[PDB]
């Protein structure tokens, strides 16, 4: 009873994703601190609109790792520009470790629970992320009273119920005795997408732009020889290749890492490239003069 106690869908905006990665990757090999500013609506929806980075702390992430001088000043600056939002959580990194809360980080979550009891704790690894979907998970505490008397699960109702999880390690131990994980949902508009797609006007100008023809001849030369040398490799493939079982032929005549497939790719890249080069040249002739 009392609190709903179902884990939020955290909607992190595009600005807030990129900003977190920016402060994390400069700071490696070290931890980073920061406060997450958003709006909370519904009974399980937090929208993390923006973030701000708390300067690098000399003791690392802890319960003293927010200085009240920076904090107050920083939120005061957002109030003068109308960018103001409310602290709905906190972020911290482990720079070399995947997502979980150490003893200190859970104790920090106990403090942020006081201020807002739907608070999120987001753990960002800055360097382990190559997709940028991965190694960002959000956690939110489930009530203490809930833990004891075994009314702990109640996060599976009022969500999709598609869960994404891995690791036993610290992660899982953290889960059982404290918090519940749910995936990071990404929100965007088509104005943020539109900005990314453009990369100047030299994006399209380059399609007309034609390289040195010294280079083209070189690429085409290499490719011609390559197809002969792989045709011979393919000749060995059809040396007989009529003995039993397909699997024993694959290993024997090198049907694994197939010479037929290799010829095919080689031909196509060159064929299509020279197609565009003839076309762009002809375009140039007729268009200019």
């Amino acid at each position: 009873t009392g609190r709903d106690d179902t884990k939020e869908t955290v909607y992190i905006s595009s600005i807030a994703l990129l900003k977190m990665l920016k402060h994390g990757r400069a700071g490696v090999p070290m931890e980073v601190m920061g406060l997450m500013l958003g709006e909370f609506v519904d009974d399980y929806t937090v929208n993390v609109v923006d973030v701000f980075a708390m300067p690098q702390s000399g003791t690392g992430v802890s319960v003293e790792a927010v200085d009240d001088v920076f904090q107050a000043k920083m939120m005061d600056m957002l109030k003068q520009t109308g960018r103001d939002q409310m602290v709905v959580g906190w972020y911290h990194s482990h720079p070399g470790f995947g997502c979980w809360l150490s003893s200190v980080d859970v104790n920090t979550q106990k403090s942020f629970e006081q201020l807002n009891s739907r608070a999120v704790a987001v753990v960002v690894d800055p360097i382990q992320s190559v997709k940028g979907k991965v190694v960002i998970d959000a956690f939110r505490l489930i009530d203490t009273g809930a833990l004891i008397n075994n009314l702990e699960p109640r996060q599976t109702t009022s969500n999709t119920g598609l869960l994404n999880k891995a690791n036993i390690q610290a992660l899982i131990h953290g889960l059982n005795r404290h918090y519940y994980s749910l995936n990071i949902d990404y929100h965007k508009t088509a104005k943020e997408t539109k900005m990314l797609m453009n990369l100047h006007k030299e994006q399209w100008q380059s399609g007309l732009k034609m390289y040195d023809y010294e280079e083209k001849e070189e690429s085409n030369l290499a490719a011609t020889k390559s197809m002969v040398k792989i045709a011979e490799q393919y000749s060995k493939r059809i040396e007989e290749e009529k003995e039993l079982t397909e699997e024993e032929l694959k290993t024997r005549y090198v049907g694994r890492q197939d010479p037929k497939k290799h010829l095919s790719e080689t031909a196509d890249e060159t064929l299509e490239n020279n197609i565009v080069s003839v076309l762009t040249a002809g375009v140039n002739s007729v268009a200019i003069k």
Partner: protein, 304 residues
């Protein structure tokens, strides 16, 4: 002091931040979002690394009235050196898309926090341009030709989006679209080649219109534009020279190599055909066998 701003690289953090910030003040109807941009400056490459709003008002009754809070700029500096000392004020973004002369005077203000000339980074947030989502200009002061005075003016200096590496990771994550222009396969670049012709053609159309308005409606002759156009006429391909003729020989050289490749594939594709028919040959026999084999199965049930 330095006049070094020849290349302006933009992190994608700056363009999405300017998109948010316009909407967190709610400026509209030729009201503007004026904030700071930070990065590195005093250098040949400028990297625009970050952006923030500032308090700012824009009056439509007279453009020489706006508000700016100076104390905000001094307090934001203290904070940003703690996060990152590689970040410093390098100038200001302006929402645009219209550049004005009063903006030169805002410019002067920003010349008192950075040694270099401030960069005024026009970021269109209204998304009217299908290209240029960044245009960059820097105020420089020079004696203009043709009996003209010393003018303080905003000259275009090259800019491109290039992204930081740390930024990249998120750019990859948020782009999950197929990308009509990405420079892919044969297909992707035939769509491009057409797009590219209409790009250039429209750019060429602006030049025509401009020229007409100089002698019709008496626009001020700006001799910089006109100088560039002399070289346009001087780099025109001229036919009937041995160069053009060698280019037509080279189109056959290239198509020659394309022909040999096309035959080579015809053998692969026929190889695949041969190999299926062998399978089907076998399968005819296997299906035939089932019919015989039933008899053998039926007989056992009766016996046992």
């Amino acid at each position: 002091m330095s006049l070094q701003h020849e290349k302006v690289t933009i992190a994608p953090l700056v363009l999405l931040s300017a998109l948010d910030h316009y909407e967190r003040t709610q400026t509209k109807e030729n009201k503007r979002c004026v904030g700071v941009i930070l990065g590195d400056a005093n250098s040949s490459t400028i990297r625009v690394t970050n952006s923030f709003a500032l308090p700012f008002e824009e009056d439509e009754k007279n453009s020489d009235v706006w508000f700016l809070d100076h104390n905000y700029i001094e307090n934001m500096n203290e904070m940003c050196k703690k996060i990152n000392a590689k970040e410093k004020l390098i100038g200001w973004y302006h929402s645009g898309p219209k550049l004005r002369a009063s903006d030169l005077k805002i410019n002067e203000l920003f010349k008192k926090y950075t040694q270099n000339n401030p960069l005024l980074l026009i970021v269109d947030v209204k998304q009217q341009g299908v290209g240029l989502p960044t245009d960059a200009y820097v105020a420089i002061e020079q004696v203009k030709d043709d009996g003209t005075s010393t003018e303080k003016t905003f000259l275009h200096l090259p800019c491109t989006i290039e992204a930081e590496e740390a930024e990249e990771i998120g750019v990859e994550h948020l782009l999950r679209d197929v990308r009509d222009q990405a420079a892919g396969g044969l297909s992707i670049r035939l769509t491009n080649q057409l797009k590219s012709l209409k790009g250039l053609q429209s750019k060429l159309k602006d030049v025509v219109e401009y020229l007409d308005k100089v002698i019709n409606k008496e626009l001020p002759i700006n001799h910089t534009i006109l100088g560039k156009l002399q070289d346009v006429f001087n780099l025109l391909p001229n036919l009937g020279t041995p160069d053009d003729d060698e280019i037509d020989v080279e189109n056959h050289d290239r198509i020659n190599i394309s022909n040999n490749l096309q035959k080579a594939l015809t053998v692969k594709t026929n190889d695949e055909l041969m190999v299926i028919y062998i399978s089907n040959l076998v399968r005819s026999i296997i299906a035939f066998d089932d019919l015989i084999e039933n008899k053998i199965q039926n007989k056992k049930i009766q016996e046992q």
